């Protein structure tokens, strides 16, 4: 279990616009947004609070479609 996902590298407050320091890559289960997409995600807004260490899922990012 080689597929990596985007994982919150710090708490991301509700309605924050994502920056690069907020997102790390990690192999986790369930799988969330693919780690390759971290470029695409900068400046997009999360619609709920994302605690440190939680996998970022498609439904947590406003406007995301992969």
UniProtKB/Swiss-Prot annotation:
Contributes to protect fish blood from freezing at subzero sea water temperatures. Lowers the blood freezing point. Binds to nascent ice crystals and prevents further growth. InterPro entries: AFP_Neu5c_C, AFP_Neu5c_C_sf, Antifreeze_III. CDD domains: Antifreeze_III. The record marks 10, 15, 19, 45 as: Important for ice-binding. This is Type-3 ice-structuring protein HPLC 12. Residues 5-64 form the AFP-like domain. The keyword Secreted applies. Detected in blood serum (at protein level). Belongs to the type-III AFP family. It is found in: Secreted. Keywords: Antifreeze protein, Secreted. It comes from Zoarces americanus (Ocean pout). GO terms for cellular component: extracellular region.
């Amino acid at each position: 279990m080689a597929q990596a996902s985007v994982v919150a590298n710090q708490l991301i407050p509700i309605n924050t616009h994502l920056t690069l320091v907020m997102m790390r890559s990690e192999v986790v289960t369930p799988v969330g947004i693919p780690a390759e997409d971290i470029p695409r995600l900068v400046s997009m807004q999360v619609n709920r609070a994302v605690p440190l260490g939680t996998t970022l899922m498609p439904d947590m990012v406003k406007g995301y479609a992969a």
